[model samples]
Target: DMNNIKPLEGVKILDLTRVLAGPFATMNLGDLGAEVIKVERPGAGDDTRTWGPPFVGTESTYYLSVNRNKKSIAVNIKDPKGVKIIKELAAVCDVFVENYVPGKLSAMGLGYEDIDEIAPHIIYCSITGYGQTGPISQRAGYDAVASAVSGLMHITGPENGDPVRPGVAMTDLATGLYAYGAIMAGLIQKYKTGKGLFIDCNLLSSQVACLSHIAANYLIGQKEAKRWGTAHGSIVPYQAFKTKDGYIVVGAGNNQQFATVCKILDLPELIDNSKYKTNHLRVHNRKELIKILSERFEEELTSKWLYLFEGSGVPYGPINNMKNVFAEPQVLHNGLVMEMEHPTVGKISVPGPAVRYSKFKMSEARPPPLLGQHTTHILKEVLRYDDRAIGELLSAGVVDQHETH
Candidate 1:
């Protein structure tokens, strides 16, 4: 049924989001062949534009990380002219995405209801830290606070240490991931019913849902969860152990694998020990078992351990940092690192799309846009605005068009 077309070939997205979650979601849609027109204010664009000690020219590396395969249109949504531009864009876009707290966009007359009235088939997705009607929904959403509130922080750090936020903003990223899927599902529903829908994607809810087994334990077993660092909560010998040179993670889910691990560690005596015979017993005696395993692991270099564990089939891998991760053969083979030519900056690279389909390859190669790089083109070509109106909007500071130097 499919030929040389991408999944969202004809889809147009009006992306009115800043920072992480909403921009991240819209970027994914863009990767899937949606025409994402990212709306930003004149002068200062996304807040992430300044969120860097690392910038190539005037572009923030952080902003470049998520925003690729999209066009930019700088419009002052606070002004009536700018608001009209947004409404016109929404009327033509198949999807409208925003991250403003519940009623902020509504107050600006760009809410789901307002857009739905004009464009009934629009899939309006809102990304927030909390839900649309929650007591805290009106408050601004930040990833760290949402992670802490949703129990992710509580279960993230060392077993006995103070809670710590994850190295990356997982809550925001998770919410973005959810928003991406929900929007696609909404598109499917729109195809079925020929009607648009409102999608509520929130960081708190997304993180809580990601709790999975931890939530099950708390809800059904009445057992609270605790942090375990790089270790598995219910399994012994299932975490990163310090080696002579570095670290290696090893896991053994069953007694047979446990025995293999013991054999590899040259602790054959541990193999038949009644106290550590089964996973349950190992978990019970985790501290002692882990201590013993730790001593053996630390005796060898990570490379030595890796060589020994090769083909052992007990699930083992080195603890890779960014240097190792990027250089990984599998990662390169999977096409995870995408390099593109930016207009302002020379060669730039960002992590690429995560999925592949049997029928089609992911569409790529567009670098993240320079702020308002397509403003004149969008107004003139996409929205069919006359040159006089476009010139007036630019003169009034209602919109901006980036002129390449």
Candidate 2:
């Protein structure tokens, strides 16, 4: 039974964050068996709760996307009584995560220093737009703006087209991933030293750090980066080509693979062509060679090309839409689509956790909670507050309780 326990089995997290980055991190922590208590605003809750035209019943699909495996407690941070509740929750929690602007929580007596006084063993994580001490740290972080500001938008679009933000909030998601790793490390450090620490995670830093080789190209070679659509900057024949029915991405990592692609395309002449023989030569003469390949690719359907490219030692795949993505055998085999019953919505599905371990399984998942769904339960069970105290707090508008049918 102990061998079957999840990695974060006994860890408890106080998540005072709405929307993507912080919620995403805490959700993953919950998946690893941490008990995540999501503190939300009384009436509106997380901003993402209202962030869609496509609502499954009263819940936005966007909110449903990230906030699973957690309990919700609605409390007004502005009120002293509500702040006391947050502090009490923080005192008992192993980790405290927040996404307010740098000084906002501190001004409300819920800052790292404030919590550290009472909860010295808590891992305090702050997710922000910029960072704790930056010129733009006060500005609220939005995914679109952070993507643009961090140069992710700059290197994301078509070769000759205007810069564009990714369809999803990549910057926010990256920040969340970084926060997840940092929190895990902080937990390890706490075990080693018997003391908790602060983790400062932000969208700008996460994205900028993710700029990986692009930053290296700039810093080391002073080379300016440009958009390449789905193509790789350093590799030739490594982008999506138009097929008769749809797009298919194809790549030739080396000369042998390049020859295999040419052989599959029935263009054996290209295999020996002096201008396109080697990868370096192909990169140099990419335009003319790609034009010829593009014309041949458009002559066949994506499925036909998929058939021809099979076992050809080339990296190739069709550009999949959402329908195709979910319908994919590999995706299904990996259990990426997790279905659960929402209390209000009959049944809903969200993308599942990414990692798998052989020793133990993921924790039993709970559906995303309704606003204030666990308020009274948390007060009574976690803080051991009396029914009279809970009733007073509920009546005073210090906290809220949502009773689900």
Candidate 3:
């Protein structure tokens, strides 16, 4: 059964989302074989389409990064005729995902209640910054703001330095993942009971959930952990260290591990030293321990020490930059990278789905749509809109198609 199965092969998702979080969530569904139709404003589309210092041809790499294996449709929700078309599409869709600010969709008559009237069994998943009903629900937010408010930024870097936003939009990505999980659960419930449910996922809540250990520590009477760079606050000698050529990270979680690390460095005598025998003692005397370890590590380059650590059964690895990460043997062997052709960009490569099934295989990656690339085709094929009606909507500025570049 697995060999012939595509998890969501018959599922139809109407995606009325822009930017990262909602689009990303729906894109994952698309990757798993759901038919995803992305709805956008007629002229200008998703904001990320223009967010770029790095562009692939005339398209934004940022937009292409998360959007693939989906079709695009442009419609003016504010127009009565266009709104009718959306209602018609929703009537046949199994799921609808949206990330408009709270009340924005309701004001435009495209909210869950509105859609539910047409398709009572539609599973509606709404993504937002603070969720549907809250004091801050109407306020605009981004991944950086959510990270800041949820204590993620506060615990990310060295305590003395300015708090740093994480290098990626971690909150947005987390929210997207959460939304996908919720959607799957909703689908299961619908299958079992024939009732659809509404799923609400927000960036703030997702950020807090991702703060895992830090939040647990604070709750357990540990003072809110301070930023310690790449080091764990509770573990000593668990940070990156400089070798002659480059940096390598080593984690000695306990006394036994410390002794093993010391043995590898040819400093076994220091393992039982009073100031460094236990993890607590080592943490307290970290400055002195670092000095000793630095001196020993400076004797060899990173590659030599990495091999030595491997032989000694100690956990250690050299720091790898983004380019190195993509080129790593394991990464390359897993087929995590994929190439696709874009209408304007020619050929582009992007990271593929991370999850792999033993039997069920995913389809080849497809390039993201050119702004409204499939608007007319989808209207005619999926929604069964007649050409005359489509042309009428287009003439009224209610629907659009991409212009050739």
Tens-place lDDT digits, model 3, residues 297-392: 888999888778876656688899889889788887787887888878798888878888876776486679877888999889888889998888
Q: Positional deviation of 307 in candidate 1, in angstroms? A: 0.8
Candidate 1: 10-residue stretch with minimal lDDT: 356-365
Identify the leading candidate in terms of lDDT. Answer: 2
Residue pairs clashing, model 1? none
Deviation in Å, model 3, residue 220 alpha carbon: 3.9
Error of 1 at 282 (Å): 1.3
Q: How well is each residue in 172-216 modelled by candidate 2, as lDDT tens digits?
A: 999999999899999999999999999999999999999998999
Model 1 residue runs over 4 Å out of place are none
The whole-model lDDT of each prediction reads 0.91, 0.92, 0.86
TM-score of 1: 0.98
Off by over 4 Å in 3: 403-405
lDDT of 3: 0.86
